[PDB]
Symmetry: D2
Subunit: 344 residues, 4 copies
């Protein structure tokens, strides 16, 4: 480093956090559903949108039993959710730390259109981000989430969208690492479209290559980062059927062609997939015959808890049973990231 | 345009605004002194920093006589200053429009360090900028100012700083043009250092080339933009003495090597220069024997009003006389941007 | 310049050559038809392809009367054609210098496919180019031609092709300027396709912006260069009919949005256009109401001499008459680059 | 792949060649000493420079015993050396194939200065490279070598030099893979200078990141490539002493931060190092506690054969003994790339 951006102590801290997140059998739980998204989910389960509703939803998910201690290496919370307290009164980050995980917080402020593109958007949130990261690390958070959205179309992702999303991801990563927070670079490719699996693999390769070029450009310490990419899955309109083995082969091939080995782990996202589909795909990815020099685990916000949310149904009396459903995913996903999961 | 970013009506509006700003004999007045900067200036003149102080300072500058009608093509205001009212009670943008100018507003939220660079910084402010631009155009503002800071050092400006400042400038320009506001791209090179004039010219050429590459990348309509670059002036520690003719030659050479002709005008900045130094340099630049296909006018926040601020001295009774000093610059600067100014 | 690439004497020489090429009423004659192209032309006129055939073809074109002294500011020759001698025995560059022009030589060695693109190609020729440029300047040549080919398709020009052609153009320009030769940057967009005029303008803007970014990157002295772009003309399959005024508006708009004013002149290419079509389009471009800070002249290899080639018909006795046809274009084109041409 | 550059059969062939080159215990022998370099070496050993001299030098090295069958996975030859024949009369590629290796050929035509840089140079050789690669694959060659030179100075490597060398490396790689030849990307950093090990690591990280960005840009199939980087070794004038463990840590750290796992192997270069120094450094690199997902072997043109060249001394009678010295390195280097080498 000509002008170092991190002291060796800071690099040690970021490496420790990142490796404790993606330790074998551990994955990320995503409770980052903002007001609109959690309102949509609560409408789906027939519940009104209030702060107490999110509070008992987190009580359902965050305050689970001790069986999910190794499964959940970390959770990502929302701002109010990070500041909210449990029924017992203890703060939620304290609950997560007692459970054994690490607290994370969604940082991005949403997507804003790019002028002159076919619906391509970039993500904002960089204003005053250093102060927010300092405050969130004061509040027990040790990693952050920033979601950038790129879509596969006939003429998209354009060069402008790819480089702009990569640059804002790198800026967010630098600001996070300057404040002791491990960034999660999340270039997320939408599964919408008629594109087949080969097209998705090609676009994922290009996007990840530009992402890590931008990370190298901004002097990002790669061992203090995580990756949250979409699995290489064909579009909903694609008539060709691809087995889980083919999904795993394409995904691991893209990650081996792009992601440097200094990345501690790759935490995949749901991307509209079902819980069983995501579990089987993660198990196949962890069972790929290729050489995989980074941890391949999960960061799911829908797969782990769709069954639990349906079981709760806006009712308190189902709580334990609903919590059971959540465990029924977490343990299973702990087997998915270890390549030890057997469906049915 | 594969996917057009502006309708022809919007392009016409931006072209009209930009050309009315830099019409012959017209320049930009910069009243963008934020709380810290205006507090420093008021401490220099021995005045406390309150909202009423800024209010009567703008009353001194904005509510001048009718002799400055052609000289001042537009002014840039601060958020409170744009929302503030005069002693008569009329809003300041109404005063500016009655005077004949066009209202502008400083948009950037300040500079934030870049990790891993020798003090290089980027500028933030993109969060929710479209809504702010819509509100400001509802408030009579038609152009905006975003100041990016690049400095000439032994190993700076780095590639990272240059491309990051160019990219954020292009993003700000696209957001502004999407809301009917003409952006002023302001890559400002600090005069600090021991570098000579050749080094400053080289760095200015590289920075402007990257700036307009980024503007082309983000589909910026160049005719709806303005440029606010520093004149090619050597550092304070540079022992070599450069005549105003050499300053003009280097500046116009850099602008001809970099700036496309679609740019309606180039409004220079003070950059720590004195009022007479800036006036003479602008007059020499407008008298350069080369072919200059864009308007070369001024955007001064110190040169036009340093004498007026000193004359005011925190006292109301000097008002008219202080206003006279302001006029003593504006008329002169109207001669500087027409190449018709004679010192002494 | 941190490490200068040209001494002031070299910059003066390049500026002098470039400005003498594009002096008002002067344009470039292109005799760069390689073995395949000149063989195709001679087959079209029913003549076999030998060295003597090219020799008397150049005798037809190069050894014209004194009426074409101001019209032809320079010619571009082939390697053998540069080394060939006239019927009188004087070398062809001596003939050109006596006529009043400046000798140029085609430098590029042809196009080679880019792997992984939809037929996109880059241009080779950089190997040992400095020695060849030194030899050619020893042989009276003062400028050079390098043709890069980009095509407008559904998904082309790709980012790879655009940046690669721009980079090889900049490398060729740097090598030429290091040896006293004024490069002609020729990013040529094929008119093939169903794309309309707006698409061609957009692609031309992007290509020219990347070209001049690459020229700035390689420290090219812009005043020692020329530009040979295609006019913004719709595809052959485009059903919409665009007037010459619209062609001129789109072309000058692209050039004003992209080309810096330091470029001494822009010498357009035929691009499959007819002689009268090219003459009328150049006349309209020179009559555009916009501000055009660079010379807008011609570099034609087909328009100036198609009539002369047809008149010759592989026969010596038509020589003078065929030469007359050539003059019938050159004078007319001298009126086209001055905006003084009247059809019929 | 939107427009595939290689059929699956071609990818299989390139993967097979690349993995057979860097199979465990195998490395590259470099006999690429051009006329000037081999003349300098022969002057050092007191021998005149003729074709027969190179012929018996290759007879010394290429026609060794059967003990070097697993050690030497491949050799890189010169054009004449590839076309030369042994004393028995069998062609040298046949000798290499019988020994068990794979034939390679140096492709680059040398370094040419970059205008406007502090001595930075780029490499030429792309002209007609596809035909040469086709001919060389017809002559038994299956991989190629292209050496690009970047140097660490006070202000170098510049951005221009880094991106230009990366782009020409990617172009060479694409041309090679289009003709069944596995390219060796060789961005070689000169050890000249007073820079310490941290500076060399930083520059190596940036150069490798740009190199693989350019490889991704040109659609290079990474599994059909090899890498030939310099070990992260401080300058000759650097007063600080770095242990072999520190060299290994810095080198593997740079490779893990930059090189994707799809690269079959990384074959280091001598870089002016001694034979024992290179062997110990390679052994330490193969013994690094980090996760190394690519083969880490050698590509030495001086370390393997300096002792053999000194033992030969321009005399035939020492042949066997000199060959013994060559074996004394090869076996040792087979232990260096397996992490099984013990000095003394």
């Amino acid at each position: 480093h000509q002008y170092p951006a991190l002291t060796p102590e800071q690099k040690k801290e970021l490496c420790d956090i990142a490796h404790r997140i993606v330790a074998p059998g551990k994955g990320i739980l995503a409770a980052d559903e903002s007001t609109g998204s959690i309102a949509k989910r609560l409408q789906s389960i027939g519940t009104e949108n209030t702060e107490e509703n999110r509070r008992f939803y987190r009580q359902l998910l965050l305050t689970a039993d001790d069986r999910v201690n190794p499964c959940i290496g970390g959770v990502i919370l929302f701002h109010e959710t990070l500041y909210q307290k449990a029924d017992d009164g203890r703060p939620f980050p304290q609950v997560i730390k007692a459970k054994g995980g690490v607290v994370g917080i969604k940082v991005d402020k949403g997507v804003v259109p790019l002028a002159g593109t076919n619906g391509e958007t970039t993500t904002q949130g960089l204003d005053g981000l250093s102060e927010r990261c300092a405050q969130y690390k004061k509040d027990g958070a040790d990693f952050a989430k920033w979601r950038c959205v790129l879509k596969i179309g006939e003429h998209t992702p354009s060069s402008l969208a790819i480089m702009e999303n990569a640059n804002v991801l790198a800026r967010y990563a630098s600001i996070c690492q300057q404040n002791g927070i491990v960034p999660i670079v999340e270039p997320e490719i939408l599964p919408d479209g008629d594109h087949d699996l080969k097209r998705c693999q090609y676009v994922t390769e290009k996007v990840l290559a530009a992402v890590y070029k931008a990370l190298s450009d901004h002097h990002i310490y790669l061992e203090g980062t995580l990756l949250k990419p979409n699995m290489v899955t064909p579009g909903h309109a694609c008539t060709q059927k691809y087995s889980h083995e083919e999904i795993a082969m394409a995904t691991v091939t893209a990650l081996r062609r792009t992601v440097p080995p200094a990345v501690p782990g790759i935490t995949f996202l749901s991307g509209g997939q079902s819980e069983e589909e995501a579990s089987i795909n993660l198990n196949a990815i962890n069972k790929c015959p290729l050489l995989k020099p980074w941890a391949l685990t999960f960061s799911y916000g829908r797969a782990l808890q769709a069954s639990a949310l349906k079981a709760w149904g806006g009712k308190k009396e189902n709580l334990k049973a609903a919590q059971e459903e959540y465990v029924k995913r977490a343990l299973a996903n702990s087997l998915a990231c270890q390549g030890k999961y057997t469906p049915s």
